[PDB]
């Protein structure tokens, strides 16, 4: 039901700040020239990027490639994952390695610091299904959510 947000508060034109400090519609040519001018004038740690939650991989690599070309490696995300130890070197460090369908084969599930009902509703539904049909035993460490 959230799709109706796609019809509201949309960004439809390039915008740059005018002489008075307000965002004003402009052409693609003008908007990118202003961005390209600043990009050419900076290098290394002076350029950084943050990716939001809804960004696609094609854009993620394109931005990483573009910032790498000015020797910037500060490609960040908003969601934190500890970089201590292996960090992101090993996929298994940050994956749901059992897979969603693998919950139906588990016999005990330990949930730590999560409310999967709202974080991953269809994953929680898979837990309940195993709870209902496989007699799965579930334990939680965290707030006693429903």
């Amino acid at each position: 039901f959230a799709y109706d947000g796609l019809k509201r508060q949309r960004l439809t034109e390039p915008m740059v700040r005018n002489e008075k400090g307000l965002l004003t519609h402009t052409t693609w040519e003008d908007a990118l020239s202003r961005v390209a001018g600043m990009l050419q004038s900076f290098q290394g740690n002076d350029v950084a990027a943050i990716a939001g939650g809804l960004v696609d991989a094609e854009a993620l690599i394109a931005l990483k490639d573009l910032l790498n070309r000015v020797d910037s490696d500060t490609l960040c995300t908003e969601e934190v994952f500890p970089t201590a130890g292996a960090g992101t070197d090993l996929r298994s460090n940050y994956l749901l390695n059992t897979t969603i369908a693998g919950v139906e084969e588990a016999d005990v599930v330990l949930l730590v610091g999560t409310n999967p009902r709202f974080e991953a509703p269809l994953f929680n539904a898979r837990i309940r299904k195993s709870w209902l049909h496989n007699d799965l035993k579930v334990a939680l460490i965290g707030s006693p959510v429903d």
């Binding site: 709870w131 209902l132 049909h133 007699d135």
Partner: protein
């Protein structure tokens, strides 16, 4: 009398399609998903081939949806994905094939509704 021909079948030069609608299109080969609003499975029997969606814009006069994509409505039907791939190959379209998704067989038991000691017992009928 027959002749030998080893070249891959290619008809892009004799189909009359403009170059733009051969090289820049992306054909999708798939079995349509069941419409979740209905239980009937008869629209999931055959393979389909559709093309990438392009721009539709509002007609200034009436507000109708205008298009410049001649392939916007084209949808072909195929017995198998091999037939669809063969058709895409000889027409020069690049394509993606998605494997058919079949519902996995379930274990159903009415008696489980009244289990003596399991959670499958239903609280209402």
């Amino acid at each position: 009398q027959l002749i030998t021909v080893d070249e891959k079948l290619d008809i892009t030069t004799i189909t009359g399609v403009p170059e733009e609608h051969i090289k820049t299109r992306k054909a999708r080969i798939f079995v349509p998903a069941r419409n979740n609003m209905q239980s009937g499975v008869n629209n999931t029997k055959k393979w389909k081939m559709e093309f990438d969606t392009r721009e539709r814009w509002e007609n200034p006069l009436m507000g109708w949806a205008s298009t410049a994509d001649p392939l916007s409505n084209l949808v072909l039907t195929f017995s198998t994905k091999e037939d669809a791939v063969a058709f895409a190959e000889k027409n020069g379209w690049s394509y993606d094939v998605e494997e058919r998704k079949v519902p996995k067989p379930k274990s159903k038991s009415y008696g489980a509704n009244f289990s003596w000691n399991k959670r499958t017992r239903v609280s209402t009928k």
